[PDB]
Design an enzyme around this catalytic site. Structure first.
Site, mmCIF file in Angstrom:
data_model
loop_
_atom_site.group_PDB
_atom_site.id
_atom_site.type_symbol
_atom_site.label_atom_id
_atom_site.label_comp_id
_atom_site.label_asym_id
_atom_site.label_seq_id
_atom_site.Cartn_x
_atom_site.Cartn_y
_atom_site.Cartn_z
ATOM 1 N N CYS D 21 -9.774 9.415 2.089
ATOM 2 C CA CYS D 21 -9.794 8.717 0.805
ATOM 3 C C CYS D 21 -10.712 7.499 0.834
ATOM 4 C CB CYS D 21 -8.371 8.313 0.421
ATOM 5 S SG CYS D 21 -7.343 7.840 1.831
ATOM 6 N N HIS D 362 -6.954 -0.851 -1.769
ATOM 7 C CA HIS D 362 -6.195 -0.213 -0.704
ATOM 8 C C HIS D 362 -4.722 -0.552 -0.867
ATOM 9 C CE1 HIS D 362 -4.002 -1.117 3.051
ATOM 10 N NE2 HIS D 362 -4.448 0.049 3.481
ATOM 11 N N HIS D 370 -3.581 4.314 1.465
ATOM 12 C CA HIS D 370 -4.442 4.978 0.500
ATOM 13 C C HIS D 370 -5.562 4.046 0.048
ATOM 14 C CE1 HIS D 370 -5.720 8.151 -1.958
ATOM 15 N NE2 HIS D 370 -4.551 8.595 -2.380
#
Lengths: 462, 464, 464, 462
Positions: D21, D362, D370
């Site tokens: 990601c 984040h 993530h």
């Protein structure tokens, strides 16, 4: 003399004597309606019983406030005359004015201006005896109870339903006075206390919904919001299930518990038992001082690798599902709130608009407390705070601060709107040399009075 | 004369005149020390500012010992101390006059004021400022203390004697030990010195075996220990907080709770479509009126039955592990706290008791506030609140309610302890005819005649 | 075989198989009743679904009485009860099978199940629904109760028996009395029936003298009283709140605080212009480090010295009056609470004690949650937590930590009391050779041989 | 196939593989700068060591994202190539790009485009040894610590003072990358934790104050705010004395205590000891249901009448004095805050403006969490949320919700501004048949690649 002068083109203050602050508020608001002081300054008692001395004193007061060069005037002569609690105290003044003007009407066929200005008519419907009910009344000042209501329309719509007989507006006075009653019995104190729930009211009020002309659809719309509300609550209940999710007494957002459980599972496992212990150039997207990922004590010990993929799959797919569920529920709730807001926004419902002219506010204990009032200066189009001597260029923000509700220990006890489609309440007549032209708005007796007082003040200045 | 007489065998109050509330506290506290009263009443200046005040004071003492009126007036004596007026200095001047006057009572050898023996002693120092050693002994009347961020009086004394990494040590201590408790600390949020209202515990009986030089080695061996122990303990606390406040984000929750909640969420029956939508005698162990098992809405949409066993196994075993970890860490922390408490509990460290005799308490602003005192009646063995006229059989619970702080506006600004190994401070000597103090018979004949004249005048004042 | 043996003279645990955590609680609770175990072990069906289950159950009882393994498995017996599955009914079916089977053991006269005598009784009614009187007696096994807004179990029982202004009355009560505590109430904020987590106190020993018809007159005379008393008490509370939360506006403060603060504001020195701008030995009673008397900024601009005496007089006397009013009202309220507590304390009302034998507790959602139990070991006189394998010497403090509620997710869903005036429920009878139960010797020879065979097999399993 | 198609004129999604990601965020932000992909799509390695395979894979990826009709593409080939922590992981990619472009430059006199775009120069001043210090450095990504800072300028002004040596900006790259470090050691937890203090940053940043050209006045202004702050605090302290006024532990507003004491004094006295117990027409200004003023228990017993006038005079005059004091203090504080706000608002200070182009955010634990990113679509002038496959028309409000601070468990870890006075970063070259015209922005090898992939997708749709 020293700071007692009135600034040019500025409002005149009222002297406070013996806790007369309420009198200053009501009198300054009633004087501010232009139509009213054009109605009372042009008043001579017909030669053809205590209404007349007070009335003449009030007329002389109006002229003084209107024409004086003094920062403030004394209402003591007029205040002393009203002798016979603050509710009934205002009641006696109003009664005196309405009956005194009643006397003035002559000939014709047996209506008084004041009952035109402050009163109207409203309907009724059948009571709970199986029999239809139809009636009409003067309803001068509409009372309202501010028990758990957010805006003025919730208050009115509740004060007109009165059990599942509903009232309806037939005749509207140009000036509309609402009462806001903060008094409710407090069990924890055993005394009637002023509840401090904030109540919103708008600068302009569309009364189209509460009149009989459109009655057919208003209930046909009221019912709908009821249905909608009986729908809306459902969603809220469902939404709280996502926000406050838990077996026991402490409840956390479900997304948070899923994210935290996933972080715990993916944390490095600790088999060991608890309680056993120049300038560097930077890459544009590098994170500096990222903490080393050494084990910390909270992580799981056994951690089967095969299961870990299970945990990641399950928990992340569920967390995304929950996020989308919550966002959809919130979108739905917001759109329902929007429809409820603007369902009365159609052009047929915006026909009658009443503009707020005055709000009378009170602070302190019920029996005795301070009173003042915010009014609208239409010429400068500015809010003004009237508090005894002080008249100030207040703003709608200080207005909302003092008047609205549980802000700064204050409450609005009366609202006074005026109709906007009838501007004669603020209109001023042609002076014919240019309109109201200030001082020259009064008959000659008041003229000479104010001129003599002003010359006396000029002598007093030295 | 109506409800102004003193009830039989009861303490007397002091009139509040021109804000003498502080003076009443100090005077009642000093007088109730029996040795002191005996020292004051037996005082004659050698005929061959302190002397006027002192005679007025001894007359006040005799009055309040033997009066029949519910409260006497210190107005005569209080007026004698003449120099938002400061009370600390005002209190100082009375003391100073008293032990200078008692100092004037010296004969024979040059050395030995009774007072200085009663309220002062001496204590050691050490020196590390310049790497140069420092050994000194001073007089330390009424040891001062700062209550900032301290839970008990032992913490307060340890801090008040360490004073930088130079430690003091007690060598000579008076039988009467007076601790000052100063809460005045500059508050930044107000730009003013405020009285911090942290609760501070003190005991009814204080053991100072830790603080004298005799056991200095051991306390130094032991103090270091608790430091280590404390430095260890915090570690556990840190880790324990991780279990109790576990979260990546701003909101943190107990980890056991998040595990249990997530597990029971997975257990719930999957629900699709999201947002769119006589008396029955009871068996002895049956749940009654249980809610049905209708699938509520917050539940996973698709659950693999095979993976649910994975989930139950992992989450149940993890929750059990976390429970056991938390209980073990809590037992360990409780253990450490217990050892720190009992560290000085051994017999070698319990040998110099000091019973709490009085506490002087304050209420209000520093410059101008109200004062009253709590003093132990030893005969009836009961605490008694002395506040101006009002003398009451208070309880140690009301004591901690006023003295401790954090309770109302009350603060305890001075603690007067007396030693228990010598009770001559509370001894009443002996009268041979009675077979002891026998109340008013202690005073000399001049005070005796005075008190009897006042009593007869009060008799006359009663009749009407 | 590694750490699986039972320690000597210790209770045995029950294996958790297919969510049998509830079954372990109910079974351990029923078995620990000694009379019940003696009734079960002495049971033979008359050869001339309940019989299979019952024999499996008696074999389970013998095993758990005499085993050497740390925990036995109810898997065989638990499997026998076959019909997010509901547990209330599941619990009901075992009871029903048991007292139907014991009902099948009738000879001679038609009347007298031991069980029904042990867990059921009868109670009165009254009738006011139609103005028509109603008198009835029912069987009331395991009286249900609602915990909504109740502090103690007596409040709960009074409410559970008044049931509208028809009151029930106890006539026959079993020696074993089982109360159900149902917390399931519909939560509007969630649209779901939630388990309310109000703390509910219950005592270790319950006196039901108030609840039987024998004293019905007096309780009715007394109940009304407390109502009056309660109706009086609230008045005081109301007025007391006026002193504690005194204010016209939204923010309310204690009135004594507002008086003291305003007075000391007036006392402060007027400040103009608004916004624009060795060791010193201490005397025994001297304030140290007092802040100076500089006139701070919040103070009245102009104060008439003549009017300040007015202000001090009025505010001081008013503050003293308010203090005395508050203390008097608080003493009165405390007095009323004490009388309400001691109302049933007289000897006539203390004669039917019931000792708390067991409590069954739940944790989690209604449909699916965890179960465990707390049972009193009478011999060692100690509480013991029975939870599946884990059998521990718990304490009544952990009891109240789990049972009371408001603590973690724990709730107490059933209370099993036993009567104290008949101890035959805990009597172990007598063995002549020993000069009583002598542990395992109670079981019949078939169970005896069974347990010995299991023990020898465990012996073989140990060696390696 | 089924919902895998890319909507016309819409951004291309990136497939998430093995917690990639972060890679999607950084790559989508770097692709979005138009200048950068015009710089890397026109890249062939000179024939004339692991930078080249990854670089070619990245170029092929860019063409695919730019020209594909698939909703999202897979970066797995490029992600796998970067093999050699997430900080250093991004560092290796950047290093590879800068050195690979380093190779491309030929002849001339021994600068690379990327060091022009992302790097510059800054100054220094003497250290605490009595010796002056002057130095300059590349300073690619400026790190920042968000410890008790409200806005981005507090953060920068603190990260450049570094003890009473101050840095100063000499050369500014067209794109300016700031790092926001939320990691601070938490004593209560004994682990480095992400602090969740909210930090404000603006959509456009005026960097004129931090450059050397105007240095002379900036400190000459910085000092002033210091003085002003050393003034401002005073007022605040004074103001709290009015808001939290009390001897003891509980403190109330002084106006409230004065008003309440006055109400208590004027309350009817109670000598008795405690614990001893149709529709009516309404006048416009009458108060209905005013509670009867019977005695209540809290009132004073003795109430000397002469003293009552003393109490009213004293307390009301003091309450009005206190109200005016507080209003004056608040006006002063507000105006000081205003001057501090807009002291850098002069035209000389608004010369250099940098527009925010990207923010990388984040969530979760430091080591693993993530990652996603908000970028600016300049053509539609709309914010866009890029999160793996999902690319959505987000708004600055969802941007502020996720990125700003302690909202909804999220934080911005990197800011990427672009200069507004240099628009060549977004400019697109003339197609000469009408500019970028989408797909026709790439050389023919990429063209044929994307066309073959699109025809394969067309076959796949059936």
């Amino acid at each position: 003399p020293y700071d007692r002068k009135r600034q040019d083109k500025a409002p005149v203050g009222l002297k406070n004597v013996g806790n007369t602050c309420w009198f200053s508020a009501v009198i300054q608001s009633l004087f501010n309606l232009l139509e009213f002081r054009r109605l009372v300054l042009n008043y001579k008692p017909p030669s053809n019983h205590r209404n007349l001395p007070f009335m003449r004193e009030l007329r002389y007061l109006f002229a003084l406030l209107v024409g004086t060069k003094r920062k403030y005037v004394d209402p003591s002569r007029a205040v002393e005359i009203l002798k016979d609690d603050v509710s009934e105290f205002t009641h006696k003044l109003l009664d005196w004015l309405e009956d005194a003007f009643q006397m003035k009407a002559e000939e014709e066929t047996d209506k008084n201006p004041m009952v035109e200005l402050f009163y109207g008519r409203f309907l009724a419907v059948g009571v709970l005896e199986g029999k239809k009910f139809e009636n009409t009344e003067m309803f001068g000042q509409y009372p309202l109870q501010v028990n758990g209501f957010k805006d003025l329309h919730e208050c009115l719509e509740a004060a007109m339903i009165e059990g599942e007989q509903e009232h309806w507006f037939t005749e509207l006075p140009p000036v509309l006075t609402f009462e806001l009653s903060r008094f409710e019995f407090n069990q924890a104190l055993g005394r009637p206390e002023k509840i401090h729930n904030k109540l919103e009211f708008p600068q302009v009020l569309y009364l189209d919904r509460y009149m009989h002309r459109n009655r057919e659809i208003t209930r046909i719309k009221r019912e709908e919001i009821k249905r909608l509300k009986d729908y809306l609550t459902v969603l809220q209940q469902r939404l709280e299930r996502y926000l406050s999710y838990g077996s026991g007494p402490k409840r956390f957002p479900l997304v948070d518990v899923l994210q935290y459980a996933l972080e715990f599972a993916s944390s490095k496992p600790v088999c060991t038992s608890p309680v056993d212990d120049r300038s560097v150039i930077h890459k544009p997207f590098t994170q500096s001082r990222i903490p080393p990922d050494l084990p910390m004590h909270p992580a799981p010990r056994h951690i089967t690798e095969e299961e870990l993929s299970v945990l990641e799959s399950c928990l992340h797919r569920w967390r995304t599902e929950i996020e989308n569920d919550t966002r959809d529920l919130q979108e739905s709730i917001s759109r329902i709130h929007r429809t409820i807001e603007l369902m009365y926004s159609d052009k047929s419902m915006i026909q009658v608009p009443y503009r707020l002219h005055a709000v009378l506010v009170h602070e302190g204990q019920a029996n005795a407390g301070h009173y003042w009032a915010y009014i609208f200066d239409h010429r400068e189009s500015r809010w003004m705070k009237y508090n005894d001597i002080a008249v100030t260029k207040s703003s709608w923000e200080e207005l909302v601060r003092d008047s609205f509700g549980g802000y700064r220990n204050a409450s609005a006890y009366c609202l006074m709107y005026i109709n906007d489609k009838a501007q004669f309440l603020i209109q001023e007549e042609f002076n014919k040399e240019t309109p109201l032209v200030g001082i020259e708005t009064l008959p000659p007796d008041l003229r000479d009075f104010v001129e003599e007082d002003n010359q006396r003040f000029e002598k007093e200045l030295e």
